Ligand binder design. Structure first.
Ligand SMILES: O=[N+]([O-])c1ccc2nn[nH]c2c1
Length: 300
């Protein structure tokens, strides 16, 4: 049974997965993605160091492959991340001049989004912008541009492709009482009030065991920021307990603005956290109990 088909039947948009050319050309990954998932994300081929390893010298080979494969197989596409501190070449983080860095960031955003204009449902524009206490993370963009880099990034992205949904995303938004969760809600509220085009908040749910229960309260709190959409991203769960996975799916179903869920990978041995067996398929590419529990929850 396809969890994407079943979640669509319940009124959601997709059940998605992160992948790339390396996975799609090996094992049973392509067959499972074709059958069970409705949306794909490039894990690395759209990050800054992959796409602009030197300033103004772009590399789209891996991203083109993923986009073409998705279109050929009738899948939605999400992509990212345009602006964050991971996957960032040294030539960017060494820039000290505000005007220079603004133009560099705008060019990076505009070039990627223009190339795939109209083909991408969701762009993760800004990622991991917050510290755990709710203050803004001191990356090169904050250091050099200041807090205006977030409004600028979204305004630039909206101008490049008005069809795409623009997201801010972060991790450790899984508890309603945690300062980071409350901080991103308050800030996104202010940004939207000022007209910044933030269409969604994406929650990067790299979860410890037992954290699914808290998502039932955190996800509604994230929805209260008033963005058109919220999404669950990078989902995996240490131990892959059905109890955690079913709680995450129920939180999605309970929040009307939550459009779908994206899991971090297909099969455990391909996870960066493989030893914690945190995905929905095992090393033999067989569905695990958590996968069956999601299917059964969505049928009922
Ligand atoms: O949901 N995702 O698995 C995911 C993976 C990588 C990304 N980069 N930007 N947004 C992303 C989402």
């Amino acid at each position: 049974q396809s969890i994407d088909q079943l979640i669509k039947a319940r009124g959601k948009v997709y059940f998605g997965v992160a992948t790339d050319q390396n996975r799609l050309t090996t094992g049973k990954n392509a067959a499972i993605i074709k059958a069970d998932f409705g949306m794909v994300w490039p894990e690395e081929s759209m990050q800054w160091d992959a796409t602009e390893p030197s300033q103004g010298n772009f590399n789209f080979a891996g991203a083109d492959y993923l986009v073409n494969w998705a279109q050929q197989n009738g899948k939605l596409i999400g992509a990212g991340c345009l602006v964050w501190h991971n996957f960032l070449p040294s030539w960017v983080s060494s820039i000290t001049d505000k005007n220079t860095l603004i133009n560099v960031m705008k060019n990076h955003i505009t070039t990627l989004m223009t190339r795939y204009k109209g083909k991408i449902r969701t762009w993760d524009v800004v990622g991991e912008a917050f510290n755990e206490d709710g203050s803004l993370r001191q990356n090169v963009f904050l250091n050099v541009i200041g807090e205006d880099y977030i409004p600028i990034a979204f305004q630039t992205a909206r101008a490049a492709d008005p069809n795409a949904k623009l997201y801010i995303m972060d991790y450790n938004l899984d508890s309603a009482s945690y300062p980071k969760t409350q901080a991103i809600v308050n800030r996104v509220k202010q940004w939207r009030a000022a007209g910044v085009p933030i269409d969604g908040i994406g929650s990067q749910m790299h979860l410890s065991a037992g954290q699914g229960a808290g998502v039932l309260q955190a996800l509604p709190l994230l929805a209260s920021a008033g963005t058109p959409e919220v999404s669950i991203l990078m989902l995996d769960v240490a131990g892959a307990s059905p109890t955690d996975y079913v709680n995450v799916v129920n939180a999605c179903l309970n929040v009307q603005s939550c459009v779908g869920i994206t899991v971090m990978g297909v099969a455990d041995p391909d996870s960066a956290f493989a030893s914690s067996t945190p995905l929905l398929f095992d090393g033999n590419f067989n569905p695990k109990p958590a996968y069956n529990a999601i299917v059964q929850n969505l049928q009922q």
